[PDB]
Design a protein around this nucleic acid. Structure first.
Lengths: 80, 227
RNA sequence: ACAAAUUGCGUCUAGCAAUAAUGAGAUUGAGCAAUAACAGGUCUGUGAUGCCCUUAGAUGUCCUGGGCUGCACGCGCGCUACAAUGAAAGUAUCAACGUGUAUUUCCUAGACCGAGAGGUCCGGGUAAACCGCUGAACCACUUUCAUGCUUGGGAUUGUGAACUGAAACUGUUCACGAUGAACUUGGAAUUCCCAGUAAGUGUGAGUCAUUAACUCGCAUUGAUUACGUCCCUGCCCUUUGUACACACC
RNA sequence: CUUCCGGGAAACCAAAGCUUUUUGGGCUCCGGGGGAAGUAUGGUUGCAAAGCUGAAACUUAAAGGAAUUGACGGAAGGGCACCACCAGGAGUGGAGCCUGCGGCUUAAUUUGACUCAACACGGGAAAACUUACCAGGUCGAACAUAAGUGUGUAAGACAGAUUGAUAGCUCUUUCUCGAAUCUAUGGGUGGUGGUGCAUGGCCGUUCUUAGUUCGUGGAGUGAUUUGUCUGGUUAAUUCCGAUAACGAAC
């Protein structure tokens, strides 16, 4: 709250939130088939640049790894 | 620490530093011109303490825009029979208060103490009625009997206690709140105590010694003799 | 001039005299500047700074912008001229303080292209060394103009051509070919100044990616007139009246 | 006229002294702060204009006495520069244009500085940046306290809105390194915010002159004077010489 000679109470109301947290629970969602096979919910990155510990996103037809959210777009782009 | 061993300007202080004058009255017979303060501190310094009267300011008017100067009335005096007065301008207080007090040592006067009505036991107050008229300030001194202290204004009592009187009816007329002639006139009032002929003094004298002639041998030698 | 510098010695003391020299009749200009001060200037030079103001919703701070440049008006500081001691063309052919790139793209030469503006290529130079011996302007030399707001004077305004920078639009400046106003010496006023000075006429430096018409010195060309006076606005302390004071506001 | 060696607050005084010592040669009027006011009110006197005569409520903390200092503030005497002329010169003030700033206006046209000594100055020749201005945005910054617990306290991008751009600044929706436990709380942080009448520092004027000021004395009750000159000469308080501190110091 300033003190200026002319302009008082500008009020653009400054609503920029910090984090909604209306979604995105941490991965308690996990199913294990009994004795002894492990089923990986949020199946991991097929990219070899990480150790596949990123829990790649379940999304629309654009998924991504967790270590970098914008990159590793699941389209899939084929290279030739 | 002195810090400096006193040098005689004149031969009078040369005589007292040689130890051939051991009497403060020896200059006081012929009114010897004492223009070094060190002789005052030679005989005295014991029971010779000082008190400031004021530190009152003045001003000198210039082209631009003022000039402020200081002025301090002060009075040193031996506790029985001596007093001194003086003042001096200065552009700073510490230059005055350590320097203006030197002047009153040139103004040390023997104060004669007298009885009032009975000739027993170390005369106390004043010989006779003496006024000091100086600049609309006429301090009239009136002798008093015992018990009754030095009545005065509130200001000049510190002079007279450090002179040596105990008992005196004393006033003056005028504006004592203009203090500048007030303490000065008392210095002329108390000085006149050896300017009054008394029938106690009607026998005179052996008529003189003149210690110039009595000590010309040390005067005649050009050697800087110690002791 | 390192002054016995010769000069009817002035109150014996500092007689102007230029004149003696023959680099030299000061080679000679700034800088440094006290005392008491003033409500001079600045807190926006500063992580000098009191006090006060503020602090996630900032005045702070970084982005996007604008604006400080906006214009019927007042004004000051300067440059452009008001042309015949010239405007044109060439020709002759002259400086100097300086200046210039290491961790940022300066100074540039050389060839090359381009009406130009500028663009390309190979260089030099961290610098008495290369730019550069910087081969500066105004003048000087044959002409062209016929004094006609005129080929003097270049404001205005289109246009493309540039180019700097991410980026231009009361504008980045520069080119070409158009456009030719106002103004012929400037009312009352009022500026500075006595010699290499005033003044003309330039270059460099400074702010700079590009923008000088200012600014700091450089250099060339080279006067009239003064060589005093105390009127006038001045100013410096000796007597001097005053009611003068926060000083005739 | 001289000097108290008298007296006064001093200039001045041979009496204004001898009124000093809380003093005395005689006699008379006559004053107790200003301004009210030499006005009223009556008497008295004048042919009149007017005089001898003279108060008060009210209002006021000062009015003046001599002296020192600021005026080598149109006032005397003497000496200096083209910030002053004259003898001039070039100019500007006219014209054009560029900038200083006011005024105008604008969302805002940031603002400092008013003679000389604010006025091409804050180097101020700014597209933005600077910038302090206006309009949209934007960052986060301590601490114990403290409560989730680490079932994600957060932190980032796609995606479409919002945007100026992508600003996951926000967010429809998605995975995510999550721990500075991102606290409401101490409060400190920052600012080209305020104030040069809070200052410092710096600078300008006072300064193209020629002046300041200290230890000794005699001037005087003190202020402060003397020094620092009557003259000569000097750009010069520069020296000589009178020479009244000099040895003074700039």
């Amino acid at each position: 709250a300033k003190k200026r000679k002319k302009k008082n109470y500008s009020t653009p109301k400054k609503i920029k939130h910090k984090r909604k947290k209306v979604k995105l629970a941490v991965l308690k969602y996990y199913k294990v088939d009994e004795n002894g096979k492990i089923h990986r919910l949020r199946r991991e990155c097929p990219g070899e640049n990480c150790g596949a510990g990123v829990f790649m996103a379940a999304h629309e037809d654009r998924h991504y790894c967790g270590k970098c959210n914008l990159t590793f777009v699941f389209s899939k782009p084929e290279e030739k | 620490e002195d810090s400096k061993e006193w040098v005689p300007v004149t031969k009078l202080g040369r005589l007292v530093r040689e130890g051939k004058i051991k009497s403060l009255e020896e200059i006081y017979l012929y009114s010897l011109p004492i223009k070094e303060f060190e002789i005052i501190d030679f005989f005295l310094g014991s029971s010779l303490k000082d008190e400031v009267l004021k530190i009152m300011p003045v001003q000198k008017q210039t082209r631009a825009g003022q000039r402020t100067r200081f002025k301090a009335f002060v009075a040193i005096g031996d506790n029985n029979g001596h007093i001194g007065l003086g003042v001096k301008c200065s552009k700073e207080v510490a230059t005055a208060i350590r320097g203006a007090i030197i002047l009153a040592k040139l103004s040390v006067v023997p104060v004669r103490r007298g009885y009032w009505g009975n000739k027993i036991g170390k005369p106390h107050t004043v010989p006779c009625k003496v006024t000091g008229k100086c600049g609309s300030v006429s301090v009239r001194l009136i002798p008093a009997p015992r018990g009754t202290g030095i009545v005065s204004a509130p200001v000049p009592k510190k002079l007279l206690t450090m002179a040596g009187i105990e008992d005196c009816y004393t006033s003056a007329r005028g504006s004592t709140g203009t203090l500048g002639n007030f303490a000065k006139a008392t210095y002329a009032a108390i000085a006149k105590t050896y300017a009054y002929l008394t029938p106690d003094l009607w026998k005179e004298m052996p008529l003189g010694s003149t210690p110039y002639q009595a000590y010309s041998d040390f005067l005649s030698k050009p050697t800087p003799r110690l002791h």
